[PDB]
Subunit: 194 residues, 6 copies
């Protein structure tokens, strides 16, 4: 993070141990579930590229995904270098590889290199989540005795990682969902099959 | 949340990791019990629409309920658009088409877009709790050997999610409850059947 | 709680997550043991009526007791309305039902937070006395039960709600009577050790 | 505790949830082991009589010991009333204990009158009497076993002595022969090293 | 760490119990996995040589590795003594924290004796991790039924402690990886063998 | 610890509950392993003699070691009395016959907190050396024991209290002698892997 000290000068404060421990445990528990992305953006709130690299490097496993994340960052870094031919921050400076912590603080017209690099990380993380999703949306079909509440929970869970809701329901609930007709809210659909 | 910095300027402070972890665990534990609503309003105390979206996005499961919550927010947003620095529209209060600085601008006539959007969330969450309630208040009936204390605990628990208390009691306690007559407090009714 | 900000103005600070989590777990663990009342008064230190309602609403189960607590608060609110016919805080304003957070801070000088806390502790004591399983008359020392444990059970029941010597076993009762009048509890436990 | 606000005024700050939870769990775990007394004085650091009553009231069980503690507080309160006859008002014994005194009065007395440290002295005094009573074994019965290592026997010896020549007397004949050969003026380091 | 007090003087603040407890537990859990190095640099943020020795001394086991770390520090200290022949000038032993007081270390911090000594520790820790790695990169071969995702997870995990990825794959996936040809990203390679 | 308050006056701040709880649990877990000494110096950072006594008194068991620690403190206190606002004597530095304000007063600034901590760490080192089970001469590598583990046990014992090559098994010992003089521990462990 960044803080203005007593003398009014903007200095970098150290990332808290609670933040570091939280980000490590959520990846150990949730791996790459869709809810990991908002937690990262929340835990990395107001972070510098130096701090963002600290949180990513502390991740232990999933080195296949972390290698793919590096490739996506290099692709966005080359795009920044193309669109854009105190010094001007290049793509490698935003990622935090060829830029000091004071330079990153210096750029923060104010250049938010922390939010720009976080945009590249979240963009690369979304691609990993879509890949590591086990089931596709077409295979999510309600069982015979499965409650409609659970089937919709599985349906939109898959859809978050990646008409049709009524098509994959069982014939007992599908008969009820079609009778509701068009313009039925999800509240009315779950209440009808309860 | 919002904080006045050393320079006197209102800046957005990052939501604490304890708040984020607390809100995630309570939803994992309590799902959608009625006591989840007061915990959300407590943990999201003084939050901006940007912060409220962060806490909702970190929720992992229950994507069926979160989709219903989005629909309820869009309905309340359209009502705000009908009844009504730029003026905050319904999508600006929800946090979709408004920056974090704009949301801070309206809060610090002061427009409490955080409390307005929180009112819509609590309104939408109450509808989910009433749906996910398993038993109806008419089906809560005291067993033969069930203590009256436990039956009343189950009675008002269901009533919180959604004369009659005496009607559903067992004939042993019901004989005692009628003898008390009208104007009997709950203290006297539980004391009589102990 | 309440805090004075940098500008000197009294603003409401948000109740900490540790306080909220603590109050939830103690009610889950201890239910309504007598030691829950001092914990509530401790965790709700310097709280506003808005904060007191927040801690009570977070309680999950025990809705029978929470319904009785509401009735006791309404009774104390009506008594405040009778004794007492920026606006004047009525009984419903102190409880936090018909009063904003700024009004409650405004009255705080009227300590609407401590007054409403007095009604809650008053209503909670009535719940603890009801949920106490045993009566003080039934607490009797067993034949082989140590006197230390029997006194632990005796004053535990007495906290929820001469006689100590009467309910003791004939082995310890003979010793306790021999001490005579004016015997401290230290001397009574030391004699039957 | 007490804290000076931004405006320079002495206000009472609320006892932290960590302190309250710590004091509750240590009594649940350790009951009344001698190490509970220094933990109480540490957790109740800079506390007012109002705060000290809060920590004692949060104790769940051991109501027999808490009843004896109240009697010891009343005994020390009567002694304070005698040594200081009651004529900012002068704090009497009941004011120091926190029964007949408001939180502002207790802060007011803090010549500065440390009513918080005085009442804490009475509590620690009363708690020591409970620890000495609840001690199971007496120092005379702590005897080393045949195969018990001397390190463990000394651990049990001074543990009992904390709740309440002789160390050599109660040792087994194998270690006692070695301890007497060392003679007088032997440190505990040399006594434990000799029987290792 | 170092802090400027109210009087403007730079004083050493005590390392937090959370930081010390975190560093102890991560070494007990992870031993010397590659992700321990970024955690050390994160927990020891802005630390003095006195603080760095405190964190290293609190490590209980692994005294063989800690003895190797001391030798690597002595080697880097001798190199500093050579490049810099001897407020006094900080020699190699002063940077390590053996022959220098806490006030002298604060005094030099501008000479970043904390970051210099941390560079030697991370340098020595990398050598320990490379040694304690069990398998070599040449022995990481995909099993017959092992999913490609897991094999790549093991591949880059070993490579982090220490063409070839396609060579060690099973003939079923190797046939697919060669068909992709040159210039294939890791995203395309994992998607092809899913 | 010590803190300068808002008025600029140096007051004693209370030791945190995390510090007290940490020091109690580490002694319960690690007893008197060598790594307990750096943890104590870390947890007692910037502490007064009053604070140092608080951490030592909270230790429950190991009263034999705590009794030896008192004797070592008395020995260092007598040495201070021989070699030497009132002047701090040996008993004042230990915290027995000196108030908390006097200890703050002495902090020419006299660091009575660091002086007394030096005596405690000195006395604790003597306890660790005694409670060490095995001697360095008895640490011998087994037949199938990996050299990494044997060196882990070797320097672990040496921390509590040529020879590394002498006690190795003949398989690794043949390799260690072939390396000759001037071999680093990195080379010795790499050779026997």
């Amino acid at each position: 993070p960044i803080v203005q000290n007593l003398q009014g000068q903007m200095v970098h404060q150290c990332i808290s141990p609670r933040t570091l421990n939280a980000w490590v445990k959520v990846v150990e528990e949730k791996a790459f579930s869709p809810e990991v992305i908002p937690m990262f953006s929340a835990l990395s709130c107001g972070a510098t590229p130096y701090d963002l690299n600290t949180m990513l490097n502390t991740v232990g496993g999933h080195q296949a995904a972390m290698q793919m994340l590096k490739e996506t960052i290099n692709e966005e870094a080359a795009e920044w270098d193309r669109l854009h031919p105190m010094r001007e921050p290049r793509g490698s400076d935003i990622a935090g590889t060829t830029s000091t912590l004071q330079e990153q603080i210096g750029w923060m017209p104010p250049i938010p290199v922390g939010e720009i690099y976080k945009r590249w990380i979240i963009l690369g993380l979304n691609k990993i989540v879509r890949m590591y999703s086990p089931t596709s949306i077409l295979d999510i079909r309600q069982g015979p005795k499965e409650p409609f509440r659970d089937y919709v929970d599985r349906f939109y869970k898959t859809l978050r990682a990646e008409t049709l809701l009524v098509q994959n329901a069982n014939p007992d609930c599908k008969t009820i969902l079609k009778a509701l007709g068009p313009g039925a809210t999800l509240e009315e659909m779950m209440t009808a099959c309860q």
